[PDB]
Ligand binder design. Structure first.
Ligand code: HEM
Ligand SMILES: Oc1c(Cl)cc(Cl)cc1Cl
Length: 153
């Protein structure tokens, strides 16, 4: 549970993401793959890419960053009332992609890093704390789903 004020701070910084969804999505994915290379092993698509410039030139990676952030943005806008949005996401990520909760922690980290790097003025401590709680609630809810689907204990 976040307060209305905490949700506003989340949505305030997310509006800056929506000015350039693709660019943010590329920075988030590249940060994830750099910080946690094992996550890039959930792939052929662009498993192979070796330099940052190669990563930035990949159409596939750019599409993928938009796929993630579009879906996360719709979730955040629900302000916790997100069971319908998480249902299909949990289904694919538990039963087809098989993404462990620890990878969702890794991407949450990357998200926070990029937001702080790009919008420090709209991502001070209170805003950081709100985004952390929103991303935590997401993780918690998706983990309960995963188990319902028989995945990951
Ligand atoms: C905030 C976190 C996440 C959101 C909102 C998200 C959302 C999505 C959406 C909307 C799709 C396309 C539809 C679907 O298959 O359900 C998808 C596909 C996929 N996602 Fe996630 N995702 C995130 C976490 C992850 C993480 C941590 C990985 C780590 C490797 C990952 C890799 C997968 C893969 C491999 C696909 C298939 C992509 C393809 O078709 O080429 N996702 N994701
Ligand atoms: O690493 C990812 C890839 Cl390759 C594709 C999607 Cl759609 C989402 C994520 Cl987080």
């Amino acid at each position: 549970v976040l307060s209305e004020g905490e949700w506003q701070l989340v949505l305030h910084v997310w509006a800056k993401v929506e000015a350039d969804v693709a660019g943010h999505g590329q920075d988030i994915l590249i940060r994830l793959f750099k910080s946690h290379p094992e996550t890039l092993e959930k792939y052929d698509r662009f498993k192979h890419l070796k330099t940052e410039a190669e990563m930035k030139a990949s159409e596939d990676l750019k599409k993928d960053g938009v796929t993630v952030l579009t879906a996360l943005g719709a979730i955040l806008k629900k302000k916790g009332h997100h069971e319908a949005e998480l249902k299909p996401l949990a289904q694919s990520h538990a039963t087809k992609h098989k993404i462990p909760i620890k990878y969702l922690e890794f991407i949450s980290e990357a998200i926070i890093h990029v937001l702080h790097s790009r919008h420090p003025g709209d991502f001070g401590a209170d805003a950081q704390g709100a985004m952390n709680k929103a991303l935590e609630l997401f993780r918690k809810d998706i983990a309960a789903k995963y188990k319902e689907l028989g995945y990951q204990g």
